[PDB]
Amino acid sequence: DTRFHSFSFYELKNVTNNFDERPISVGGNKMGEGGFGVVYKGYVNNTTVAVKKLATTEELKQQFDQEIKVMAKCQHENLVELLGFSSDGDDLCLVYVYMPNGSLLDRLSCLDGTPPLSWHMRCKIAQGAANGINFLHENHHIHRDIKSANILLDEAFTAKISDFGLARASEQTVMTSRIVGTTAYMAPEALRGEITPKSDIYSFGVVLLEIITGLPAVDEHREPQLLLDIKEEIEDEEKTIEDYIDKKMNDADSTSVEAMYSVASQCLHEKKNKRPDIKKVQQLLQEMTA
């Protein structure tokens, strides 16, 4: 129930300086890649924008149409806002409201010298991302790729879920022959082909451990290589959550950290049916602050 502006490919190509692959530091427009396309910076109709140039040529178009369909239905403060698209020119384009603070992944890794996020900001981001996932679930949508690189941050560090190309509708448990997502964030059933909102909750649990630790979901040069495994180290009493807390924080209290960890631990239950639903995750995150 939302109609979008149709942008000219050449208006987008013009404003993004002919889709420059160079970073913003040197003089280019490229903001990043991974979402089956490349994101560029632009200025259109008196507003700063993000332009996603998509990007089988038919499978990429499916990822383009589904994103428009999901964004036409799903409008929430904790979701990215689509302004319009482009189909006329060579490549397919998606135009969104610009997210000045980029991704949660980049802000947890302090990429390009940006200051570390305070525990106060992290609690707000976790609550915001949970409100975004709740909105999608209440509206019978499964994201299928909940990860820190897909949680974007605005002018006020408000969390905004992005990338709905792989999203699926509900309004059970479906199965698929095309297993999509990011392995390090994926639930056991999702890696096996199942399609359930319960898998989105698991992925969110990995995101909460990233928020607490400031560690990426997967690191080749690390023990354990997968962040989700720390849950076992803490459960076996070999280590504690306090040993994993991001040292790049001066405002993190033990009570709220443990309260967030408890939510992440519950989210990361290997049995899909034992996991809390998004409404419970939302409640618990609110109770943590309050």
- Residue 131 sits in the site that holds ligand 4S2 (CB under 6 A): no
CB nearer to ligand 4S2: give 100 or 188. Answer: 100
- Residue 157 sits in the site that holds ligand 4S2 (CB under 6 A): no
CA distance 115 to 170: 40
**Shortest Cβ 106–ligand 4S2 spacing (Å):** 6
Among 39, 44, 151, 211, binds ligand 4S2 (CB under 6 A): 39
Name the residue with tokens 């000219």: 8
Binding window for ligand 4S2 (CB under 6 A); candidates: 8-16, 94-102, 177-185, 245-253: 94-102
Binding window for ligand 4S2 (CB under 6 A); candidates: 101-109, 181-189, 214-222, 272-280: 101-109
CA distance 52 to 46: 19
- Residue 12 sits in the site that holds ligand 4S2 (CB under 6 A): no
Among 45, 47, 100, 176, binds ligand 4S2 (CB under 6 A): 100
- Whether 200 and 163 have beta carbons less than 8 Å apart is answered as no
- Residue 181 sits in the site that holds ligand 4S2 (CB under 6 A): no
Binding-site residue set for ATP: 31-39, 52, 147-150, 163
Residue 251's SS3 state is coil
**Whose CA is closest to 164, among 267, 88, 52?**
52
In angstroms, the first-to-last Cα distance of the chain is: 36
Q: Clarify whether 145 is annotated catalytic.
A: yes
Run of H or E including 73: helix 57-73
Binding to ligand 4S2 (CB under 6 A) within 245-264 occurs at: none
CB nearer to ligand 4S2: give 103 or 158. Answer: 103
Question: Is the dihedral angle over the CA atoms 204, 280, 256, 78 positive or is it negative?
Answer: positive
CA distance 147 to 260: 17
Residue 222's SS3 state is coil
**Shortest Cβ 141–ligand 4S2 spacing (Å):** 15
Among 35, 42, 181, 214, binds ligand 4S2 (CB under 6 A): 35
| Position with the least CB separation from ligand 4S2 | 32
Residue 236's SS3 state is coil
- Residue 93 sits in the site that holds ligand 4S2 (CB under 6 A): no
- Whether 108 and 144 have beta carbons less than 8 Å apart is answered as no
CA distance 260 to 139: 25
Among 13, 30, 52, 231, binds ligand 4S2 (CB under 6 A): 52
State residue 152 phi and psi, 5-degree precision.
-95, 155
- Residue 70 sits in the site that holds ligand 4S2 (CB under 6 A): no
**Shortest Cβ 286–ligand 4S2 spacing (Å):** 26
- Residue 34 sits in the site that holds ligand 4S2 (CB under 6 A): yes
Residue 52's SS3 state is strand
CA distance 52 to 238: 44
Among 15, 31, 74, 207, binds ligand 4S2 (CB under 6 A): 31
Active site residues: 145
Q: By CB under 6 A, name the binding residues for ligand 4S2.
A: 31-32, 34-35, 39, 50, 52, 80, 96, 98-103, 106, 149, 152, 162-163
